[PDB]
Symmetry: D2
Subunit: 115 residues, 4 copies
């Protein structure tokens, strides 16, 4: 599992469940090609997006659909979504955990990269 | 100015100076059209991006060039840039400050919306 | 002022107003002696805590009363308060801004130290 | 495992290993009684601090020794330590994960509480 996404809710102090996540890869023509998608589970984690074979070097965009998450809780948040853009595997294959901590008008995102 | 950007450096405990910022507006065809740009000052702030007249309701994207910032400091960063995407609304407060706190492998962004 | 405190509300996207702040200095016997206190203004800032003369080198604790802040808003919080503990040094920059970003179950704090 | 501590390094994008953690409980006499201690492992996690039986209702303080961590990496950071203070188990037993994200001049801390 080379790419995992974990999302927490800073208002409730709980995992953020059922959060939609769309991943894109920058193509040779400079456009964003859809790469993988899924939704977080009860643990706030999204596993199985891709495989080591498919996850080649490139620039990736992880789009976390925070607006839909907050709206379902009765909240009108600031951001449309949280976007996380990074080059992956340029020094060989690595495992990436993309974490996000959500509040209605703020979010943080962190990458944990292991070899 | 209705839209301001403020950036801090979490490693040095200082304003993040000379950080390039590009603002885009979502067009009818869903593409991003350049709207405004600038570099943060010695105070880490970017003022004068737009005007009350030009800043109409719509979806905007604020792109913070964090990769170049860390590169200039000789520190290996994770993200290509920090992206802040939001809808501007005439209802609530009229002043938007997009704040960002930067670390090499993590960043936080907050919208401070006031009158 | 050599020491300023600035607090933001991550839920409302606004300055955190009327937040009580207590500053302590570490005494010879290792106990915390009250040093200065105040409430954040409508801008979320607390100025005038101390003076250049009084703010000598030493270890200080800045206590931010986050529990009462959330309580007043009818929102259940996790922490009793946010504590910021640091050593004041004559060497580096002389102005200390203790920034804090508050959510009910999470907070971030950053020291912006400048001239 | 009712109380776990997890620490990440925002500069390296990795778990923060060998970080000392001291936990205290507020006594009936208003003083901080030492409750448990340990150090984070290779995963940046600290397990086995206490048991459900020992972890009764009370106000707890989790002190994370961030200064020593940064110093070992050649960095002189701002904070002496990160303190996390909270009431636990006032509505019956819960499981608490205390997370911290470290940068030299900034840190965030989040609580994930489950039943």
């Amino acid at each position: 599992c080379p790419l995992m996404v974990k999302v927490l809710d800073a208002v409730r102090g709980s995992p953020a469940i059922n959060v939609a996540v769309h991943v894109f890869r920058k193509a040779a023509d400079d456009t964003w090609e859809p790469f993988a998608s899924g939704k977080t589970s009860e643990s706030g984690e999204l596993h199985g997006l891709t495989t080591e074979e498919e996850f080649v070097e490139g620039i990736y965009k992880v789009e976390i659909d925070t607006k839909s998450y907050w709206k379902a809780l009765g909240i009108s948040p600031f951001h449309e979504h949280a976007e996380v853009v990074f080059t992956a595997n340029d020094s060989g294959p690595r495992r990436y955990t993309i974490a996000a901590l959500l509040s209605p008008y703020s979010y943080s995102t962190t990458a944990v990269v292991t070899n």
